[PDB]
Amino acid sequence: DAXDDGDGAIP
Ligand SMILES: *C(=O)/C=C/CCCCCCCCCC(C)C
Ligand SMILES: CC(C)=CCC/C(C)=C/COP(=O)(O)O
Ligand SMILES: [Ca+2]
Ligand SMILES: [Ca+2]
């Protein structure tokens, strides 16, 4: 995951 928002959303 990326983004610090978990899976998907912001990469
Ligand atoms: C968050 O989504 C983390 C997920 C773990 C998987 C990451 C992808 C690893 C493999 C990438 C392979 C790239 C190819 C060879 C272009
Ligand atoms: C490492 C970089 C440059 C960004 C994306 C790499 C990746 C593993 C994406 C998956 O993240 P999500 O689950 O947040 O979509
Ligand atoms: Ca992911
Ligand atoms: Ca994300």
mmCIF file of all heavy atoms in Angstrom:
data_model
loop_
_atom_site.group_PDB
_atom_site.id
_atom_site.type_symbol
_atom_site.label_atom_id
_atom_site.label_comp_id
_atom_site.label_asym_id
_atom_site.label_seq_id
_atom_site.Cartn_x
_atom_site.Cartn_y
_atom_site.Cartn_z
ATOM 1 N N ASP A 1 0.825 -1.182 0.000
ATOM 2 C CA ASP A 1 0.000 0.000 0.000
ATOM 3 C C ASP A 1 0.871 1.249 0.000
ATOM 4 O O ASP A 1 2.009 1.235 0.469
ATOM 5 C CB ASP A 1 -0.911 0.054 1.211
ATOM 6 C CG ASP A 1 -1.908 -1.079 1.367
ATOM 7 O OD1 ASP A 1 -2.271 -1.718 0.319
ATOM 8 O OD2 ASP A 1 -2.344 -1.319 2.511
ATOM 9 N N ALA A 2 0.286 2.342 -0.448
ATOM 10 C CA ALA A 2 0.937 3.641 -0.399
ATOM 11 C C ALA A 2 -0.030 4.695 0.121
ATOM 12 O O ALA A 2 -1.240 4.491 0.123
ATOM 13 C CB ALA A 2 1.454 4.027 -1.784
ATOM 14 N N UNK A 3 0.488 5.879 0.548
ATOM 15 C CA UNK A 3 -0.436 7.016 0.715
ATOM 16 C C UNK A 3 -0.776 7.280 2.182
ATOM 17 O O UNK A 3 -1.230 8.357 2.547
ATOM 18 C CB UNK A 3 0.137 8.252 0.029
ATOM 19 N N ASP A 4 -0.590 6.263 3.042
ATOM 20 C CA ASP A 4 -1.074 6.321 4.423
ATOM 21 C C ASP A 4 -2.599 6.349 4.498
ATOM 22 O O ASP A 4 -3.201 6.806 5.477
ATOM 23 C CB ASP A 4 -0.460 7.438 5.269
ATOM 24 C CG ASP A 4 -0.622 7.194 6.759
ATOM 25 O OD1 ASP A 4 -0.589 6.011 7.193
ATOM 26 O OD2 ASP A 4 -0.751 8.168 7.517
ATOM 27 N N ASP A 5 -3.262 5.797 3.466
ATOM 28 C CA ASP A 5 -4.711 5.651 3.465
ATOM 29 C C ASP A 5 -5.127 4.217 3.161
ATOM 30 O O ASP A 5 -6.289 3.971 2.846
ATOM 31 C CB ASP A 5 -5.375 6.595 2.450
ATOM 32 C CG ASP A 5 -5.104 6.261 0.997
ATOM 33 O OD1 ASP A 5 -4.166 5.464 0.765
ATOM 34 O OD2 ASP A 5 -5.812 6.826 0.148
ATOM 35 N N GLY A 6 -4.213 3.272 3.324
ATOM 36 C CA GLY A 6 -4.525 1.879 3.084
ATOM 37 C C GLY A 6 -4.568 1.538 1.604
ATOM 38 O O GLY A 6 -3.942 2.185 0.765
ATOM 39 N N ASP A 7 -5.234 0.408 1.334
ATOM 40 C CA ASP A 7 -5.235 -0.176 0.031
ATOM 41 C C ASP A 7 -6.007 0.718 -0.934
ATOM 42 O O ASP A 7 -7.077 1.234 -0.615
ATOM 43 C CB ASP A 7 -5.896 -1.553 0.089
ATOM 44 C CG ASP A 7 -5.740 -2.380 -1.183
ATOM 45 O OD1 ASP A 7 -4.679 -2.353 -1.800
ATOM 46 O OD2 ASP A 7 -6.730 -3.058 -1.546
ATOM 47 N N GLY A 8 -5.481 0.844 -2.139
ATOM 48 C CA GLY A 8 -6.116 1.710 -3.117
ATOM 49 C C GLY A 8 -6.139 3.163 -2.675
ATOM 50 O O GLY A 8 -5.266 3.617 -1.942
ATOM 51 N N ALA A 9 -7.097 3.920 -3.170
ATOM 52 C CA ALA A 9 -7.128 5.371 -2.937
ATOM 53 C C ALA A 9 -5.839 5.985 -3.429
ATOM 54 O O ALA A 9 -5.448 5.779 -4.598
ATOM 55 C CB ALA A 9 -8.268 5.990 -3.749
ATOM 56 N N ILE A 10 -5.216 6.837 -2.613
ATOM 57 C CA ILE A 10 -3.984 7.452 -3.059
ATOM 58 C C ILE A 10 -2.909 6.384 -3.139
ATOM 59 O O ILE A 10 -2.776 5.573 -2.202
ATOM 60 C CB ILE A 10 -3.571 8.576 -2.084
ATOM 61 C CG1 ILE A 10 -4.679 9.603 -1.808
ATOM 62 C CG2 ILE A 10 -2.268 9.190 -2.552
ATOM 63 C CD1 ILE A 10 -5.526 10.024 -2.803
ATOM 64 N N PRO A 11 -2.149 6.249 -4.225
ATOM 65 C CA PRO A 11 -1.163 5.178 -4.287
ATOM 66 C C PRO A 11 -0.080 5.282 -3.209
ATOM 67 O O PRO A 11 0.334 6.372 -2.803
ATOM 68 C CB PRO A 11 -0.555 5.297 -5.682
ATOM 69 C CG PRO A 11 -1.601 6.088 -6.501
ATOM 70 C CD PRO A 11 -2.214 7.015 -5.481
HETATM 71 C C1 LIG B 1 0.760 -2.152 -0.927
HETATM 72 O O1 LIG B 1 -0.071 -2.088 -1.847
HETATM 73 C C2 LIG B 1 1.842 -3.106 -0.957
HETATM 74 C C3 LIG B 1 1.730 -4.236 -1.690
HETATM 75 C C4 LIG B 1 2.803 -5.274 -1.859
HETATM 76 C C5 LIG B 1 3.057 -5.662 -3.258
HETATM 77 C C6 LIG B 1 3.961 -4.702 -3.996
HETATM 78 C C7 LIG B 1 4.316 -5.150 -5.405
HETATM 79 C C8 LIG B 1 5.560 -5.993 -5.484
HETATM 80 C C9 LIG B 1 5.865 -6.574 -6.833
HETATM 81 C C10 LIG B 1 6.128 -5.615 -7.954
HETATM 82 C C11 LIG B 1 6.602 -6.277 -9.241
HETATM 83 C C12 LIG B 1 6.858 -5.265 -10.315
HETATM 84 C C13 LIG B 1 6.973 -5.760 -11.739
HETATM 85 C C14 LIG B 1 8.090 -6.747 -11.913
HETATM 86 C C15 LIG B 1 7.132 -4.598 -12.697
HETATM 87 C C1 LIG B 2 6.191 3.048 -4.570
HETATM 88 C C2 LIG B 2 5.368 4.014 -5.362
HETATM 89 C C3 LIG B 2 6.166 4.961 -6.195
HETATM 90 C C4 LIG B 2 4.046 4.023 -5.340
HETATM 91 C C5 LIG B 2 3.084 2.894 -5.583
HETATM 92 C C6 LIG B 2 3.538 1.495 -5.162
HETATM 93 C C7 LIG B 2 2.426 0.584 -4.711
HETATM 94 C C8 LIG B 2 2.856 -0.692 -4.044
HETATM 95 C C9 LIG B 2 1.159 0.907 -4.923
HETATM 96 C C10 LIG B 2 -0.039 0.305 -4.293
HETATM 97 O O1 LIG B 2 -0.588 1.270 -3.373
HETATM 98 P P1 LIG B 2 -2.189 1.308 -3.046
HETATM 99 O O2 LIG B 2 -2.673 0.012 -2.496
HETATM 100 O O3 LIG B 2 -2.252 2.435 -2.082
HETATM 101 O O4 LIG B 2 -2.911 1.595 -4.371
HETATM 102 CA CA CA B 3 -2.399 -2.195 -1.960
HETATM 103 CA CA CA B 4 -3.330 3.897 -0.731
#
